[PDB]
mmCIF file of C-alpha atoms in Angstrom:
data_model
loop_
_atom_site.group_PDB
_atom_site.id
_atom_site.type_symbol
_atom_site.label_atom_id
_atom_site.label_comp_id
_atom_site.label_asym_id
_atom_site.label_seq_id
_atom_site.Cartn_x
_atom_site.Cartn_y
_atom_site.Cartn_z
ATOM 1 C CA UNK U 1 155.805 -17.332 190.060
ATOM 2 C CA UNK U 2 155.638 -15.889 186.077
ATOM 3 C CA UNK U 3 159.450 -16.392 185.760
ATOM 4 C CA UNK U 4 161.415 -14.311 183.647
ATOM 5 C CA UNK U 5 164.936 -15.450 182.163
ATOM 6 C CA UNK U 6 167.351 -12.469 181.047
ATOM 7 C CA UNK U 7 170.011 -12.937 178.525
ATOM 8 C CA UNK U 8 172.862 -11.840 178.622
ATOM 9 C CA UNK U 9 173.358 -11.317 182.413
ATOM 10 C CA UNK U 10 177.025 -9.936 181.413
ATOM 11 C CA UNK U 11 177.555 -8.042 178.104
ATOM 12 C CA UNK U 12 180.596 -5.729 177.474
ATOM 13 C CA UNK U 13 180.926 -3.841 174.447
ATOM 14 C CA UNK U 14 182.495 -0.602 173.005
ATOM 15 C CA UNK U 15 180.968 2.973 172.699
ATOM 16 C CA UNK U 16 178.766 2.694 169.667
ATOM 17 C CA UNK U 17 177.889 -0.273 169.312
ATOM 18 C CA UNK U 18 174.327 -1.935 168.865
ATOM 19 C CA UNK U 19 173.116 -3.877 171.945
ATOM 20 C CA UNK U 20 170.658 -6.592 172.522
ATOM 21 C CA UNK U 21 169.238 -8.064 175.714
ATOM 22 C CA UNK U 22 166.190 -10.369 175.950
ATOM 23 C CA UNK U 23 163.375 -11.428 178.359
ATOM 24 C CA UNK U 24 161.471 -14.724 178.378
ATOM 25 C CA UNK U 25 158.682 -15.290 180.431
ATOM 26 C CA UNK U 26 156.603 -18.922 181.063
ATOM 27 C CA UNK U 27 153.061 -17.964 181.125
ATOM 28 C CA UNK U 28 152.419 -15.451 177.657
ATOM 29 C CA UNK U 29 152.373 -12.098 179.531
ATOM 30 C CA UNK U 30 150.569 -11.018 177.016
ATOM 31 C CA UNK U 31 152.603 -7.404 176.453
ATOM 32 C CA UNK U 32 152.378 -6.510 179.913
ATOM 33 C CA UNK U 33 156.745 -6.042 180.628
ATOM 34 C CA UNK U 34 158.183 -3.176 181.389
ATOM 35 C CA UNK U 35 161.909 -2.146 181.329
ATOM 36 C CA UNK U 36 164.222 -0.419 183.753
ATOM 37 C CA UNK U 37 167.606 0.877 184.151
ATOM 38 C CA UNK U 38 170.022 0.863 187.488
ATOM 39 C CA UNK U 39 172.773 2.983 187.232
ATOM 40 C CA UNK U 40 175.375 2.447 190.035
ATOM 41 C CA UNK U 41 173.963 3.656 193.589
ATOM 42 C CA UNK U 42 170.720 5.192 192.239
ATOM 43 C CA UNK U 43 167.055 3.884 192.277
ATOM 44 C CA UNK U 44 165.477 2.359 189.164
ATOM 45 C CA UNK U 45 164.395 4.107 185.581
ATOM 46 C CA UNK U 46 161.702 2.804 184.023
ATOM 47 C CA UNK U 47 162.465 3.104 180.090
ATOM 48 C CA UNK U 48 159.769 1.302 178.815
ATOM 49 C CA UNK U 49 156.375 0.815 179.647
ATOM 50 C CA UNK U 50 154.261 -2.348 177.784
ATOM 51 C CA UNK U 51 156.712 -3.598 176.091
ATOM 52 C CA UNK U 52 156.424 -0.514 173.744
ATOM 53 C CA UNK U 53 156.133 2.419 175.090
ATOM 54 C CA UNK U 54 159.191 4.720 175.482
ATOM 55 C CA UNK U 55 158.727 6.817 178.717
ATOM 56 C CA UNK U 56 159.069 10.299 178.729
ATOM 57 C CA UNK U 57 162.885 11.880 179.010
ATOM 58 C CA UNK U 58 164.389 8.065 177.740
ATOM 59 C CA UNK U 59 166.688 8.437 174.941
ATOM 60 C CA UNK U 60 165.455 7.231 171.314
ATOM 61 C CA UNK U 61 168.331 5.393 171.268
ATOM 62 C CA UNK U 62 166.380 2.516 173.296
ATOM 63 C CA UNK U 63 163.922 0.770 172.123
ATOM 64 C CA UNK U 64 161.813 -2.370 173.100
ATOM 65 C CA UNK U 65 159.575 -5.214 171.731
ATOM 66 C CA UNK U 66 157.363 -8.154 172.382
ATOM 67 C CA UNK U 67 154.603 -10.530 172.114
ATOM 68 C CA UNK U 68 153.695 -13.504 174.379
ATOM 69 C CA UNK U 69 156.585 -14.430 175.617
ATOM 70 C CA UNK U 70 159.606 -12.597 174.159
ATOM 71 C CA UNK U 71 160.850 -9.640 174.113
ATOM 72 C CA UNK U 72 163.902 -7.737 173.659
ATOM 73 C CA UNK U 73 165.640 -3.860 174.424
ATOM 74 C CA UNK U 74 168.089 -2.350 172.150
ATOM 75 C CA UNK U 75 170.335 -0.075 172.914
ATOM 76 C CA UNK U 76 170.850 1.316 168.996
ATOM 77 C CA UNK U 77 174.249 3.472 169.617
ATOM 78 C CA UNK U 78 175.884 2.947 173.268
ATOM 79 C CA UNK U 79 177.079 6.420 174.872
ATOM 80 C CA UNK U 80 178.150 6.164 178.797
ATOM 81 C CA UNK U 81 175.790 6.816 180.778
ATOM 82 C CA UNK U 82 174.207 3.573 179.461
ATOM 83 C CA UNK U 83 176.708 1.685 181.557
ATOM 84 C CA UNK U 84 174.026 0.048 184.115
ATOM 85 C CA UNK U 85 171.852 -3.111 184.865
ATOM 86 C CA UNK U 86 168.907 -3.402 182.852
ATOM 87 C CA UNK U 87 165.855 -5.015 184.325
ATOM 88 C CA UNK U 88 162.775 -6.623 182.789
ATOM 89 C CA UNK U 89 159.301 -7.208 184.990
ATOM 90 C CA UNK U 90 156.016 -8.794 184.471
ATOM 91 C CA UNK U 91 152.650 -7.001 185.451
ATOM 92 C CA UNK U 92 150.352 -9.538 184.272
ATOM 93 C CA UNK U 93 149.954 -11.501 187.502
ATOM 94 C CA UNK U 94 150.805 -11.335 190.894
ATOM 95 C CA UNK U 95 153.608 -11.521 192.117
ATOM 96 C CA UNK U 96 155.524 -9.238 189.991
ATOM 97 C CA UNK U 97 159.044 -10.513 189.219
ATOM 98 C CA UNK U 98 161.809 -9.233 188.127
ATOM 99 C CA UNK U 99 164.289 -11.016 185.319
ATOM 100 C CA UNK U 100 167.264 -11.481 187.259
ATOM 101 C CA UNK U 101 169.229 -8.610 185.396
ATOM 102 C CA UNK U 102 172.141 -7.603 182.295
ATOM 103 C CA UNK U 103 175.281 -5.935 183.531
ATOM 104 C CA UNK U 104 176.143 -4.056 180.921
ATOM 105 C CA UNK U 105 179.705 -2.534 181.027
ATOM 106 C CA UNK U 106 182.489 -1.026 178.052
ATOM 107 C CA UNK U 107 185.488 -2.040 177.606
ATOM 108 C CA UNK Q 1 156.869 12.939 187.263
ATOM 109 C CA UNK Q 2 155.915 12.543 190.680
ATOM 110 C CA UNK Q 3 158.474 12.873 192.965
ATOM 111 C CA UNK Q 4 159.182 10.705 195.675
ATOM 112 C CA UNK Q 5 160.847 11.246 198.796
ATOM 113 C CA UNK Q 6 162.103 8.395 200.867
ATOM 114 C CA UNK Q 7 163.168 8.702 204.615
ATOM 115 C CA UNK Q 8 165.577 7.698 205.946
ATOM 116 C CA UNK Q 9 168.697 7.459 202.936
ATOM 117 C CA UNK Q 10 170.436 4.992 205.844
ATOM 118 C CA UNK Q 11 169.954 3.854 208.619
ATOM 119 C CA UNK Q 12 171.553 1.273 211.333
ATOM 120 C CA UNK Q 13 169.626 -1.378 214.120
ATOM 121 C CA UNK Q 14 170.791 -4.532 215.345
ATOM 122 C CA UNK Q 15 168.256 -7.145 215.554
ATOM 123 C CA UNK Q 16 165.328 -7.174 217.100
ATOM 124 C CA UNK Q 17 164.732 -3.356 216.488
ATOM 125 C CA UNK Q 18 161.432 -1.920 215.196
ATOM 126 C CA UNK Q 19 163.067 0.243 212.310
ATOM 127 C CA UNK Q 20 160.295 2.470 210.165
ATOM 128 C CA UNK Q 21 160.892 3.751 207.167
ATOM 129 C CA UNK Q 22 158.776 6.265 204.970
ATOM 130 C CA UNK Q 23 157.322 7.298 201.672
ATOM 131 C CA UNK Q 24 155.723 10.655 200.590
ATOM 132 C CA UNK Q 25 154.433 11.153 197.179
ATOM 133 C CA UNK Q 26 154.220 14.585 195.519
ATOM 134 C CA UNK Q 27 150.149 14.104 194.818
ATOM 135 C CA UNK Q 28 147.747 12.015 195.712
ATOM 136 C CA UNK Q 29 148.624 8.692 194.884
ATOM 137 C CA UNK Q 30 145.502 7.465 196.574
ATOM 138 C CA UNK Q 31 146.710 4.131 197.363
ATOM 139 C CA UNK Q 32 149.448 2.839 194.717
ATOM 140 C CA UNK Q 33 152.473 1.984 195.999
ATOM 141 C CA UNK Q 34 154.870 -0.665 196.253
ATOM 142 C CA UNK Q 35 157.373 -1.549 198.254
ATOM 143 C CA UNK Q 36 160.696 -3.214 197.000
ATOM 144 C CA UNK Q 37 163.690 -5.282 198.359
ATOM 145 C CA UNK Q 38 166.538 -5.553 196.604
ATOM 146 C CA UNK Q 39 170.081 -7.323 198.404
ATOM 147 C CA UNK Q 40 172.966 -6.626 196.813
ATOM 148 C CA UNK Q 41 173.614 -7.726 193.277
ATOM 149 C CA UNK Q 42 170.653 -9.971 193.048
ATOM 150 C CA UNK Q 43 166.651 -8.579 190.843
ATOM 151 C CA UNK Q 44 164.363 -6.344 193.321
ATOM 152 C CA UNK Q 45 161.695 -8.172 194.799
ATOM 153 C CA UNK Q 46 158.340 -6.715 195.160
ATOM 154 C CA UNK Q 47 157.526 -7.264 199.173
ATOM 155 C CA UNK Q 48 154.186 -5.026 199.679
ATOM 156 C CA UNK Q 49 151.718 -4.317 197.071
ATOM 157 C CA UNK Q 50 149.265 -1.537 196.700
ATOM 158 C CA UNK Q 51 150.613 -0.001 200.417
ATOM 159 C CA UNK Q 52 149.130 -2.944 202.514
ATOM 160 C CA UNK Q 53 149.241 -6.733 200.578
ATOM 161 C CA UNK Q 54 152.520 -9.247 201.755
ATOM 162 C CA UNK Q 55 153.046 -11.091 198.630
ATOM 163 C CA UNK Q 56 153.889 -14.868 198.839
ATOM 164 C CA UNK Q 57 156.173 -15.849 201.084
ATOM 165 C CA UNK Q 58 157.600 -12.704 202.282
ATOM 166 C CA UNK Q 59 158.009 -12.936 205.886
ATOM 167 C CA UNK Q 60 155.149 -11.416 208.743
ATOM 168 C CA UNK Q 61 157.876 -9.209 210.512
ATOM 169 C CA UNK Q 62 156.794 -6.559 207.199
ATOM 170 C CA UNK Q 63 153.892 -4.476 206.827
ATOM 171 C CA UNK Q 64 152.794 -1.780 205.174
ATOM 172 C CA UNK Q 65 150.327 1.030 205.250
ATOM 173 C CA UNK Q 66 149.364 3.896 204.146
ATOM 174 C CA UNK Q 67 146.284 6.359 201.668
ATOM 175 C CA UNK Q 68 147.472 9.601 199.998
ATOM 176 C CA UNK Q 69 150.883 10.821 200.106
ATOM 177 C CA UNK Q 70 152.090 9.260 203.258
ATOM 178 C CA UNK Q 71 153.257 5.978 203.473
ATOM 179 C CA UNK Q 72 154.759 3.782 206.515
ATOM 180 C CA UNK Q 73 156.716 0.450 205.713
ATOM 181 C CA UNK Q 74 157.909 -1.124 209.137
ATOM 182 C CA UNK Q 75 160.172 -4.051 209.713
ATOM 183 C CA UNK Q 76 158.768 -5.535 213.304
ATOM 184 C CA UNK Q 77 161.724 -7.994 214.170
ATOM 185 C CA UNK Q 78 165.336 -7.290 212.581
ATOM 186 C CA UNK Q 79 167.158 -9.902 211.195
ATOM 187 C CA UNK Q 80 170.452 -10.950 209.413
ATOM 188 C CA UNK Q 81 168.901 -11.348 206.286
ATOM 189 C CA UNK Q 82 167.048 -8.351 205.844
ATOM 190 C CA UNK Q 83 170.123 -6.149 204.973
ATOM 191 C CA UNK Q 84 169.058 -4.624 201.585
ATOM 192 C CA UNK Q 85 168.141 -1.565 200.259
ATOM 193 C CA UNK Q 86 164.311 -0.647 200.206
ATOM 194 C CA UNK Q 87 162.143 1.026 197.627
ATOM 195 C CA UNK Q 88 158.869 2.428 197.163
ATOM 196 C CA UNK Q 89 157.743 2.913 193.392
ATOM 197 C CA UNK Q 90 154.128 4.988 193.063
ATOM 198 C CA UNK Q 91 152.182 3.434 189.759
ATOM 199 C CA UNK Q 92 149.091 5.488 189.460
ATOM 200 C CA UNK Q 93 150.451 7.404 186.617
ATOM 201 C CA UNK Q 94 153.546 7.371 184.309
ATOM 202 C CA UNK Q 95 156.784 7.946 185.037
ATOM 203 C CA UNK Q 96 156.769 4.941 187.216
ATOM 204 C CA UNK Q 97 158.807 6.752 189.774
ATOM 205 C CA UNK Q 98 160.645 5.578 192.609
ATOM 206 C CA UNK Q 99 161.998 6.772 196.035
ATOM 207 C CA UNK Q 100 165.511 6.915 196.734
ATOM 208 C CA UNK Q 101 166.564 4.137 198.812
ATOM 209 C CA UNK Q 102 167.023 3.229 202.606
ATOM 210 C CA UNK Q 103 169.987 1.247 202.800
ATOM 211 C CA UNK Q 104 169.604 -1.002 206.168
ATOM 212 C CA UNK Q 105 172.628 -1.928 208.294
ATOM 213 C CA UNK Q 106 173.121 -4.251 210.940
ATOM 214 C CA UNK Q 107 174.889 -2.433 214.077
#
């Protein structure tokens, strides 16, 4: 319904270095995306909650941003347990969707 | 946060089979929870809103219901294509928490 584009959907990099994925939603979502991580067999993490918001117990090495339409999720300095998919969803309207993911992996 | 506990982790029925598969919350949750499907490499889709409400086209074999800390998602009909792996996520405070995960097989 609100679709959401994620970019990359396959990133590989090396421990240390600075990552960037993106969102895009079609309607302005106003701030209203949060972020999550799915590590390998587990349920999702939510990291980041409106846009903003770093969640209790998430490293400070992620952070997020975001007006409108864009937005974005750094991963400052990559370690290994980072090695997951990375999801963005909209809240402002029902249904809720879901970008359709980053794999991140290291090389 | 608050802690979720999905039941069953697995579970196997060939199709046509009622399966049932639960959600308790740690608290009162009072009514927020959702209820996710997510097949295998693709974004989680949100099936059930706030314990009861189908969301656009998702199909009238699911329901949900539920009020507290007990929760009851049930699949009436079996199919091929609902091999996934199901979530609840409570939302009435942060952490954003989810359930474990029932993995459904086809036997």
């Amino acid at each position: 319904d609100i679709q959401m584009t994620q970019s990359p959907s396959s990133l590989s990099a090396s421990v240390g270095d600075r990552v960037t994925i993106t969102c895009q939603a079609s309607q302005d979502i106003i701030k209203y995306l949060n972020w999550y991580q799915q590590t390998p067999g587990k349920a999702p993490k939510l990291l980041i909650y409106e846009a903003s918001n770093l969640q209790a117990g998430v490293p400070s090495r992620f952070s997020g941003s975001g007006s409108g339409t864009d937005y974005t999720f750094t991963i400052s300095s990559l370690q290994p347990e980072d090695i997951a998919t990375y999801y963005c969803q909209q809240y402002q309207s029902l249904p809720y969707t879901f970008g359709q993911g980053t794999k991140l992996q290291i090389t």
